[PDB]
């Protein structure tokens, strides 16, 4: 087509979605991790994760307001990934990289799994 | 902080939100324009428009599944702006610029109003 494009649009949209999350506005699901609860928007979770995409496109699960993750999932790893989903920023540290990579593999967040694999390979 | 950032994350999120819109997945509102209906996600509309932000933060309106726009709003102008919200791409043409700018002013989409004002000023 002959469209023009606003370079900062996608980033401004994500920034606003994160402001809604902060203020708990229109959040429609609670993700339960080892008795740690995280409120979020189903659409953002689906846009970021192959696991949430599969969950919320399921005719029965699409209507659930609570999703319980596998007990092996670490709440801090999940929190770091949820922050990444809403900001593009990943708080990757020596102390959390194993939990973050394991959580990203479970959530099916391929780009996160990729940078974790590379950061781990650099330290060996 | 000491975060790393994935450059294409915001764009990939918006692309996925637009794929959900295309497939009518988890759309939670219908916007009615001169008897033309548009399905969308409330959170994306709020992230893009000062008008939708004000509407869906209202304690009564936040629960509506149908929103009727002012009858002076042109459906094509709205359609072009809805596409922009989900893609960052604005289909601005000599034949639609007046309707697009009027719709962007009503929706409170300041960056769109700005480029319309500039494109109009260039043609005078």
């Amino acid at each position: 087509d002959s469209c023009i494009q606003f370079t900062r649009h996608a980033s401004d949209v994500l920034l606003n979605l994160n402001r809604l999350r902060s203020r708990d506005i229109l959040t429609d699901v609670v993700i339960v991790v080892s008795r740690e609860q995280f409120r979020a928007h189903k659409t953002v979770l689906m846009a970021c994760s192959g696991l949430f995409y599969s969950i919320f496109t399921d005719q029965l699960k699409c209507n659930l307001s609570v999703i319980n993750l596998d007990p092996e999932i670490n709440p801090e790893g999940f929190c770091i990934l949820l922050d990444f989903m809403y900001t593009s920023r990943l708080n990757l540290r020596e102390g959390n990289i194993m939990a973050v990579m394991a959580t990203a593999m479970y959530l099916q967040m391929e780009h996160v799994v990729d940078t974790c694999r590379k950061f781990i390979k650099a330290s060996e | 902080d000491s975060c790393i950032q994935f450059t294409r994350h915001a764009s990939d999120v918006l692309l996925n939100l637009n794929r959900l819109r295309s497939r009518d997945i988890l759309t939670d509102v219908v916007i009615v324009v001169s008897r033309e209906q548009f399905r969308a996600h409330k959170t994306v509309l709020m992230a893009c428009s000062g008008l939708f932000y004000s509407i869906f933060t209202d304690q009564l309106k936040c629960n509506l599944s149908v929103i009727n726009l002012d009858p002076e709003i042109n459906p094509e102008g709205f359609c072009i702006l809805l596409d922009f919200m989900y893609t960052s791409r604005l289909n601005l043409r000599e034949g639609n610029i007046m309707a697009v700018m009027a719709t962007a002013m009503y929706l409170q989409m300041e960056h769109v109003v700005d480029t319309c004002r500039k494109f109009i000023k260039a043609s005078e």
Partner: peptide, 4 residues
Amino acid sequence: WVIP
């Protein structure tokens, strides 16, 4: 704004 840019030409994409």
